């Protein structure tokens, strides 16, 4: 089974601003691990069009996913909720879902921060490519179950260390696998 | 299935006009998801990717995108979720010649229209 | 389920001249996602011994897989038909196939060219080895309907930056996913 | 199903010195394809603490997962048999499992060294991040079936090049899948 | 199913004596497989991953690890296996402030234990 | 199931002469795609990987591979699928010493044969 953001969403991404992204996000389930694939296109606001020289200080931003007890994206989320479902076709099913327990990042894999600090096999790195230009890397950071006010959690950070000049923040794919709760 | 009226069309209006694009659109019983209207424009440089121009999402209006555009593009309709997601786009620039497109989607449903723009 | 070109195929590949590489290609079907793995062995002709001492201009060759609207391959593809095909044990059922449409790219997730450019996600990018050795980085950049002349279209493009000087172009494995059409 | 290590296992691994470190692997069986997901975790000893001013020779190290004709787990394999099992929840069944071909690499894709030399794709490179610091990357070279005295292996290769000073030897987490033996 | 008497604990003592860390376990029907002692402490920098104090598996102790508790640390019981994964803390120093984790396993049982411990 | 006559095979001839490399094959009831015969050697330098000789797919001979072995390599039979995808090196040399490899494949059946050629 597949839990998605539909392959071609609308705005449904909030960084800076309401509505500034979108965030294509597949989640397949395979048995215990989750196969997933991510892309983020920026369409507004301060992270659409990068420019170091301009500012040289924008170097890394964040997108959080936060889940409660039955896997049901939270509100206060950067992505919104409206089309992130099961799918039907290449859209979703009508109804908004109710528990996607066995999508959600295994919190014995992935504890929430404690006493201890979470081990660095919490996190995936994968290097992207803005606009699909190989001289254009950037890192895509994810890790699991860093984050409060939430029972589960998946956040991606997008960072980059060469100085652009008028690029535009679209996003190769990138493929990960994470250790499913159930 | 979800379908919009002339999913392909020619415009042409001139110079100082107001432009109006049609995205007429018909539900199908499957469609009970919630209604998402998305409008993009293909930039004249054919190596910059398409741009959001104006939402309808969570019955509100979210038209901070496509600068050359701010201000100047609205939905018409005063019952945009009986079916009609059209725009209209004011005082028409020589730079406004380009490929619009209009996407409705009410999960499961889903349709896409594109307009061809010509301003003289 | 799987479709492959096997494990251990002869030459199957034509790039530069007939026959002069070998493509390994699985694709195993996980429901709206395909995992995919990919390797290449050229064999013969210019591709085969890079040496960019001699040639400094050759940096970059693309393989071209093409399909019809039932997911069959075409012949102008640069891969070859008569073992790309549905696995049986480590080679292939007997019987050329009918249908794959659920193996095909997603033309929702990855639109042909248009008036609009396609969007950065509709590529992956892999670095791999050549000769499986840590300073011989190559970049496989795999595209999703690109191409013109088919239904659906997977391309291969393999590039490097360093001046490589008589190193055989055989690389190391790349795994990636992909959005599937059903 | 799935063969793991669990997610938060005790020492599982002897490198340097008896039960030094924490490998861990899940494998997912998608058919011909097993997707599998690793980190390590070195606890004590030589690897632990990587300082390259005070010891500039240590850049490499290796961990073999060896199986025999069953695809079970050798006792001369530096990873130990005690907690690699089939999963129950977050642990294991409690029988030691006595089949697992299935989820070994497949010898037809990768066979063992020969009067040839074993191709490049019989590798998959990855880069993971040491305590999850985008400015600490290793390489994790993985090698199917180089090993001798046993059927099957799995060979994990720990690398770096940069000069390291008091590191600690942990990793982010990596993605790859192989072609299975059935 | 697997669990351990008071999951998590604060004990104080003071500086120079010996402090028992109590690790109590009560094994369930299902519990067959191999039992797995491991005990962790996590380092005052907070900066740094937890480390391995010691262990017991496959019927034998393991105590090469942190090296500030080295030969400090011992199992108490003379019957660990029937339910007793104790362990003590000789010479207390001001340093050894800080949360120790004793995970207890017998595949597919699972628990762990967390103890605060304070010196004075 | 698909198999070849003698799959590992030591041949010894003399310089100047003509080496026979068998290969003849055995096909199974199953054995219904499309016939496919690979031939590689092994590299004195054992730092580089296999190298293609010579091929039979499609009905159709390929032979621009291995450079030090063109011209002087030849299937032999007048049928060769009918069994017989044997091959000869003409003109041997001390350097044609090593390891050959007949791939024998007709989907789902597949085969390979190893040849030790000593040159004297
Ligand atoms: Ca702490
Ligand atoms: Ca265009
Ligand atoms: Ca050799």
């Given amino acids: 089974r597949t839990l998605w ?8 991404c909030t960084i800076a601003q309401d509505k500034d992204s979108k965030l294509t996000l597949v989640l397949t389930k395979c048995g215990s691990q989750i196969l997933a694939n991510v892309s983020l296109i920026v369409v507004a606001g301060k992270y659409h069009i990068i420019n170091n020289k301009t500012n040289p200080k924008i170097k890394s931003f964040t997108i959080k996913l936060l889940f409660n007890k039955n896997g049901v994206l939270l509100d206060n989320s950067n992505l919104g909720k409206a089309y992130w479902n099961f799918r039907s076709g290449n859209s979703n099913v009508s109804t908004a879902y109710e528990k996607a327990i066995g999508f959600m990042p295994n919190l014995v894999a992935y504890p929430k921060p404690s006493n201890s600090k979470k081990y660095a096999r919490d996190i995936v790195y994968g290097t992207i490519y803005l606009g699909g230009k190989p001289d254009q890397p950037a890192v895509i950071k994810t890790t699991f179950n860093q984050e409060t006010g939430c029972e589960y959690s998946i956040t991606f950070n997008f960072s980059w260390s060469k100085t652009y000049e008028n690029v535009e923040f679209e996003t190769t794919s990138f493929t990960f696998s994470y250790i499913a709760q159930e | 299935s979800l379908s919009i009226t002339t999913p392909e069309e020619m415009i042409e209006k001139a110079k100082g006009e107001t432009a ?34 104006i939402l309808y999402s969570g019955d509100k209006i979210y038209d901070d995108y496509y600068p050359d555009l ?3 593009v609205h939905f018409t309709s005063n019952d945009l979720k009986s079916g009609d997601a059209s725009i209209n786009v004011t005082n028409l620039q020589l730079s406004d010649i380009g490929t619009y497109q209009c ?16 301003v003289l």
Same sequence: chains 1, 3, 4.
């Fill in chain 2, 103 to 118: 996407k409705v989607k009410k999960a499961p449903g889903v349709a896409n229209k594109k307009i061809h723009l010509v």
């Fill in chain 2, 20 to 53: 109006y694009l049609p995205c007429k659109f018909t539900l199908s019983p499957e469609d009970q998801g919630p209604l998402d209207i998305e409008w993009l424009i293909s930039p004249a440089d054919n190596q910059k990717v398409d741009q959001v121009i």
């Fill in chain 1, 5 to 12: 953001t539909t392959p071609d969403t609308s705005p449904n």
């Fill in chain 2, 70 to 72: 701010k201000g100047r």
